[PDB]
């Protein structure tokens, strides 16, 4: 309150009470005036056209929204090391969003000379969509989230939603949410904003890789008293059918009776990082899994949590089945393979079928050798199962969350769903933390002396600045495994190199070299 008094102190510490990790964070935000304070609608008809698949119809609201659903907004890589190394899961528990220390600045352009003097009177609006009655757009890893390195000052991304679209034309159901129609809160350089949010009961995330393959869950020393069919012909010859069973023991663990079967599968195309082995044709789009509701295709990216590759095939990775984050300084499009870092998932090859493999096989006809009056001599033929739905007793493991990976994602308000764990990884919440849309109010320049009924399109250019602080207390589940072989941990290699990992370059650009998973500890099935 008042110009000469800071409205809130810069908290950025990361306390570790024990079974609670309060991870405050603060970055400086700069927010321009988007769309000249208008609500221009967007369609591919305006963006120059697009394919049938890429058609969209939505509105370009002038509000900027603070997004912080990426793990590296809060966790310094050292904290992320302390949380993956020794912990068996975590989940957010609360939130606290202090928006303080606004200063609105007026930009004047005379003869191409930029003079920036602040407005001690202009106001910037803030409000939280606390009933989710707006189209939730947090939850696709949209690149506008808070700066990985605290000092980094970031530009607040623009808020624009999409609605129904028959081609590029709206339909009757196409909704148009006017943001100002919501009760805002006006801050005018001496005020601060704060809402506390309580995370709902979201299940503990799996921060552990399984040290017991789901198909080697048995005892390797005792038979299993469940005989399996072993032979069907006594020997090579004519008319020598028989039916010989045998016990399923440790000598033959393939045919062993099992209580549980690996999780779902939706086969992905296989592409190998060694560019020589891939076929010499453009199979980027044609030949990748897609689900295609309403007649328009869309890549099954990243799809159901599936292991990237079979043990020993490191070079491979599914076409559209892994998050592929871009390293700092990479181009927007058509970058080479080495400038983008790929998240491999070998960590759940135990209880998930391999993404590029075909989940077993199912017999397709009857092995009735000699039939009565309709003889076919049909041998038992087997067909593969490229895609398999969830059956009785099937277990699986959800996808991993990386340091550069999303936290939450609103569960679409639908009449039903199954295991709402957002496929990109994270937590599925019916009531995620709300959006915080911020807009700096228009202030018309100089209306005419004579009346005029138009919308007064001449506003004076201005922007804002301040700080934003997101304290989000996690809850841990400490590990108490009686394992004797030393655990596997995440470390930074001790070897001389030009730059320290996760540390600034000579120019000052903060570089994250590799994605950090959260499955390092081991817990038996």
């Amino acid at each position: 309150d008042g110009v000469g008094s800071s409205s809130g102190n810069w908290h950025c510490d990361s306390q570790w009470l024990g079974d609670r990790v309060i991870t405050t964070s603060t970055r400086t935000w700069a927010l321009p005036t988007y769309n000249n304070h208008l609500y221009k609608q967007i369609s591919n008809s305006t963006s120059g056209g697009s394919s049938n698949d890429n058609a969209y119809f939505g509105y370009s609201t002038p509000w900027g929204y603070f997004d912080f659903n990426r793990f590296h907004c809060h966790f310094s890589p050292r904290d992320w090391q302390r949380l993956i190394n020794n912990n068996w899961g975590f989940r957010p528990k609360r939130l606290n969003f202090k928006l303080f220390n606004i200063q609105v600045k007026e930009v004047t352009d005379n003869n191409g000379v930029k003079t920036i003097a602040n407005n001690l009177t202009s106001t910037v609006q803030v409000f939280t969509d606390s009933d989710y009655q707006l189209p939730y757009v947090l939850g696709s890893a949209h690149e506008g989230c808070l700066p990985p390195f605290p000092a980094d000052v970031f530009m607040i991304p623009q808020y624009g939603y999409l609605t129904l679209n028959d081609g590029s034309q709206a339909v009757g159901r196409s909704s148009f949410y006017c943001l100002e129609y919501f009760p805002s809160q006006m801050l005018r350089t001496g005020n601060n904003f704060q809402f506390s949010y309580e995370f709902e009961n979201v299940p503990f995330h799996s921060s552990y890789a399984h040290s017991q393959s789901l198909d080697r869950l048995m005892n390797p020393l005792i038979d299993q008293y469940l005989y399996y069919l072993s032979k069907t012909i006594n020997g090579s010859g004519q008319n020598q059918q028989t039916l010989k069973f045998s016990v399923a023991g440790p000598s033959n663990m393939a045919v062993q009776g099992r209580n549980y079967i690996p999780g779902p599968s939706y086969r992905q195309q296989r592409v190998s990082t060694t560019v020589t082995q891939n076929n010499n044709s453009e199979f980027a789009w044609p030949g990748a899994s897609s689900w295609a509701l309403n007649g328009r295709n869309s890549l099954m990216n990243p799809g159901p949590a599936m292991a990237s590759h079979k043990e020993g095939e490191d070079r491979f990775f599914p076409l559209s089945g892994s998050l592929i984050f871009g390293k700092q300084g990479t181009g927007r499009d058509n970058v080479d393979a080495d400038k983008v870092m790929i998240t491999n998932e070998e960590e759940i090859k135990t209880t998930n079928p391999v993404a590029t493999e075909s989940y077993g096989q199912v017999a397709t006809n009857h092995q009735s050798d000699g039939t009565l009056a309709v003889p076919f001599k049909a041998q038992a033929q087997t067909g593969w199962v490229q895609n398999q739905g969830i059956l009785p007793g099937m277990v699986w493991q959800d996808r991993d969350v990386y340091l550069q990976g999303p936290i939450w994602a609103k569960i679409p308000h639908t009449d039903g769903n199954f295991h709402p764990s957002p496929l990109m990884g994270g937590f599925g919440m019916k009531h995620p933390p709300p959006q915080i849309l911020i807009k700096n109010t228009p202030v018309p320049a100089d209306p005419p002396t004579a009346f005029n009924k138009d919308k007064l399109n001449s506003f004076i250019t201005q922007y804002s600045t301040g700080q934003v602080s997101v304290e989000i207390e996690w809850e841990l589940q400490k590990e108490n495994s009686k394992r004797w072989n030393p655990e596997i941990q995440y470390t930074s290699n001790y070897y001389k190199s030009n730059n320290v990992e996760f540390a600034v370059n000579t120019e000052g650009v903060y570089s994250e070299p590799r994605p950090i998973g959260t499955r390092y500890l081991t817990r038996n099935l």
Binding site: S236, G237, K377, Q379
Partner: protein
């Protein structure tokens, strides 16, 4: 450092067509370590428009013409030791 033991089964088979399709299992390849690959090559066969070259453990055969067949399963382990055992297939 035991070399792999390649055991192809069944060794001998008598099949009479409209069921030429026959499979001989080769997955019974005993070794200490993982069998890195399986190699199948047919040494003798009646002249056919195609020649059997595959790497699958369970060899799939289709469109078999009358005659005598002799297939050879070659296995390689991690170290590199190879053991080759031959399979004889006969069609009436």
């Amino acid at each position: 450092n035991r070399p792999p033991i390649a055991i192809v089964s069944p060794q001998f088979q008598e099949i009479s067509l409209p069921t030429t399709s026959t499979v001989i299992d080769g997955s019974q390849s005993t070794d200490d370590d993982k069998i890195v690959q399986y190699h199948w090559e047919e040494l003798k066969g009646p002249l056919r428009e195609e020649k059997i070259s595959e790497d699958t453990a369970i060899l799939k055969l289709s469109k078999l013409v009358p005659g005598n067949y002799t297939f050879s399963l070659t296995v390689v382990d991690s170290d590199g030791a190879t053991n080759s055992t031959t399979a004889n297939l006969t069609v009436n």
